[PDB]
Structure 1
């Protein structure tokens, strides 16, 4: 849900720029224990309502793993790197799933974000980071959930350059 990001430091907002046309994204997440989760998403603006359409194909998750055993404890906060490739915006991230016994299971997200707007109408951002926090509440077992997310797009201010780079 990439429309909801706070941008700092004069970084152009690829997603908000994409309206009214909207955008798509496509991702494969590769899990360290062999699972794959692939998704395609369409984002459109319908009046005063954003509309998401998602397609999912997941496979090879180990039967004994935290995913198939339904014993996962949510995600740690994450950091995504984003930069231009082939005139579109690519995203790369590692995430860590909380597991029983204070353990983590890691995975890698390979994303391409595609504006439905022509290149001529878009300001492409420079290399930058997006900090994400996703928090989930299971309201009814396997049936009803609530999800909260916070996201910020930024440069690396925490570790400063000595060449005056971002």
Structure 2
């Protein structure tokens, strides 16, 4: 839900800038055990309501893996890198799924974010990071879930530059 990000240090907000038109995103997530999860999403503004429409295709998840065995323990917090490619915004991230026995299963997210506004009408952000944290509670088995996420967009303040870069 890319509209809900705290942007610091004056980084342009590609997603909020896109309204009222909205934006789309497309992603393939590659899992280290051979699974793939591909998604396309449309984000629109219907007056005072945001409308998300998502299409999902997932495949090759091992039958004995934590995904198909339904033994996943949620995601670790993650960092995404974002930068312009071909006049749109690209995103790249690694995530880690918590597994039984204190193990992790990693994956890579390959994302392109596409504004429905033309590039000429937008202020494109420079290379930056988005910190994310996703938390899930299963209310009813395989039926009802609740999900929380916090997200911040920033430069690298933690490790400072000598060359005066961001």
| TM-score over 0.5 for the pair | yes
* Post-superposition offset of 1:120: 1.3
SS in 1 for 2:58: strand
Following TM superposition, where does structure 1 have runs of at least 4 consecutive aligned residues deviating by more than 3 angstroms? Answer: none
Q: What is the rounded CA distance, in whole Å, between the counterparts of 1:119 and 1:54 in structure 2? A: 24
Q: Gaps spanning 5+ residues in structure 2: where?
A: none
Q: Gaps spanning 5+ residues in structure 1: where?
A: none
Q: What is the rounded CA distance, in whole Å, between the counterparts of 1:100 and 1:140 in structure 2? A: 21
* Post-superposition offset of 1:132: 0.1
Q: Give the number of equivalent residue pairs.
A: 166
1:15-49 C-alpha deviation (Å, 9 max, x unpaired): 00000000000000000000000000000000100
1:73-124 C-alpha deviation (Å, 9 max, x unpaired): 0000000000000000000000000000000000000000000001111000
Measured on the aligned residues, the alpha-carbon RMSD in Å equals 0.2
Q: What is the rounded CA distance, in whole Å, between the counterparts of 1:159 and 1:119 in structure 2? A: 32
Q: What is the rounded CA distance, in whole Å, between the counterparts of 1:119 and 1:67 in structure 2? A: 38
Query: What TM-score, normalized by structure 2, do the two folds share?
Result: 1.00
SS in 2 for 1:161: coil
